[PDB]
Design a protein around this ligand. Structure first.
Ligand SMILES: O=c1ccn([C@H]2C[C@H](O)[C@@H](COP(=O)(O)NP(=O)(O)OP(=O)(O)O)O2)c(=O)[nH]1
Ligand SMILES: [Cl-]
Ligand SMILES: [Cl-]
Ligand SMILES: [Cl-]
Ligand SMILES: [Cl-]
Ligand SMILES: [Cl-]
Ligand SMILES: [Mg+2]
Ligand SMILES: [Mg+2]
Ligand code: NA
Ligand code: NA
Length: 326
DNA sequence: CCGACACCGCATCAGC
DNA sequence: GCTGATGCGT
DNA sequence: GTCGG
């Protein structure tokens, strides 16, 4: 965090472009800049210096000079004042409420936590759960707590079918000391890119987890992706643990390595990796790595038996999960 | 310039 | 109902 | 907002 101040500014700017300006690309642009600067091993002294890095152009260089001289950014000063912007930015913090709905709600006079609570009838299922755990969801998960959660999940999944394989990915697999949520990659020999010899594969596990009261709510649920809420149990007289977001993803067992690579992240790392893949003539998703034909159409999935094989194809030296935190 | 920017599952909608 | 666009978080 | 051709 040598440049904590700058990356914060950039991040704040990215949020404004996404939530207020609904400018997907300016948002991603700022995120890339905050990222590349976060890994820069020197306390940046000027915009010039920063512009040397990819993703940091002329505009951001100007802003960094302003930030270093004054210790702040006028553009953000104003944005903070603007009520509409402050409102939209706040509402988007509720899971399920994105830039559009945020702007719409403000248009209705619904712009505070108070306003949302007395207007639940105006929220879809996801938004209502997001408002319900507004506090909890903004809290971080200590890794120790992640270890307890991992234990419960792997053991409850084992009890359903000894052939299930559950791996905790995301920041946890990257070794983070705290996580925003718990992500679980699941596989069962019955479900492959070839056939789904068994139904309810994900259901059964969600069910078992709800039975032991681990999972408490469901934001969304399909045959392969489950987005929900969970909570570790507490001891006698002990205050209850905060509710945590949980994501489970069922992937074909034969496509495990593309899945684990994807679910391990980070998001920006995957973005930079999928970009390089494209510049190399390939395309990568959570299922496979395919080559790209002249026309641009993806071809047949190339053989993969390790995460490293994927890195090889794109001519990238292997990077351990801990080193993919961009 | 200026086109491209990673990729996709589930919820919800309009239009038929 | 089916299908495709769009929101949202992934 | 930034980049490569
Ligand atoms: O835009 C996205 C979001 C997530 N992902 C992948 C990578 C990420 O590590 C993984 C898990 O998603 P989370 O949103 O849980 N991210 P992560 O676990 O890295 O961070 P956090 O600790 O905030 O949950 O999904 C993407 O590829 N693109
Ligand atoms: Cl944009
Ligand atoms: Cl500022
Ligand atoms: Cl694979
Ligand atoms: Cl695929
Ligand atoms: Cl996902
Ligand atoms: Mg996560
Ligand atoms: Mg997650
Ligand atoms: Na640059
Ligand atoms: Na939100």
């Amino acid at each position: 965090t040598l440049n904590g101040g700058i990356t914060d500014m950039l991040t704040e700017l990215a949020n404004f472009e996404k939530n207020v300006s609904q400018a997907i690309h300016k948002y991603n642009a700022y995120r890339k800049a905050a990222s590349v600067i976060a890994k820069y091993p020197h306390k940046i002294k000027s915009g010039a210096e920063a512009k040397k890095l990819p993703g940091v152009g002329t505009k951001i260089a100007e802003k960094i000079d302003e930030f270093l001289a004054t210790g702040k950014l006028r553009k953000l000063e104003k944005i903070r004042q603007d009520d509409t912007s402050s409102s939209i930015n706040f509402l988007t913090r509720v899971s399920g409420i994105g830039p559009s709905a945020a702007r719409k709600f403000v248009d209705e006079g619904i712009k505070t936590l108070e306003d949302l609570r007395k207007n639940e009838d105006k929220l879809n299922h996801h938004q209502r759960i997001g408002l319900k755990y507004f506090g909890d969801f903004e809290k971080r998960i200590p890794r120790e707590e992640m270890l307890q959660m991992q234990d419960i999940v792997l053991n409850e999944v084992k009890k359903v079918d000894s052939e299930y394989i559950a791996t905790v990915c995301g920041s946890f697999r990257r070794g983070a000391e705290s996580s925003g949520d718990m992500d679980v990659l699941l596989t069962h020999p019955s479900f492959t890119s070839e056939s789904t010899k068994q139904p309810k594969l994900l259901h059964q596990v969600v069910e078992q987890l709800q039975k032991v009261h681990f999972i408490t709510d469901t934001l969304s649920k399909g045959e392969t992706k489950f987005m929900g809420v969970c909570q570790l149990p507490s001891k006698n007289d002990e205050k209850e643990y905060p509710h945590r977001r949980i994501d489970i993803r069922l992937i074909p067992k034969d496509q495990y390595y593309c899945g684990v690579l994807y679910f391990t992240g980070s998001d920006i790392f995957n973005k930079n990796m999928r970009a390089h893949a494209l510049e190399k003539g390939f395309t990568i998703n959570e299922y496979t790595i395919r080559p790209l034909g002249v026309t641009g159409v993806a071809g047949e999935p190339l053989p993969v038996d390790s995460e490293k094989d994927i890195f090889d194809y794109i001519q990238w030296k292997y990077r351990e999960p801990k080193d993919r935190s961009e």
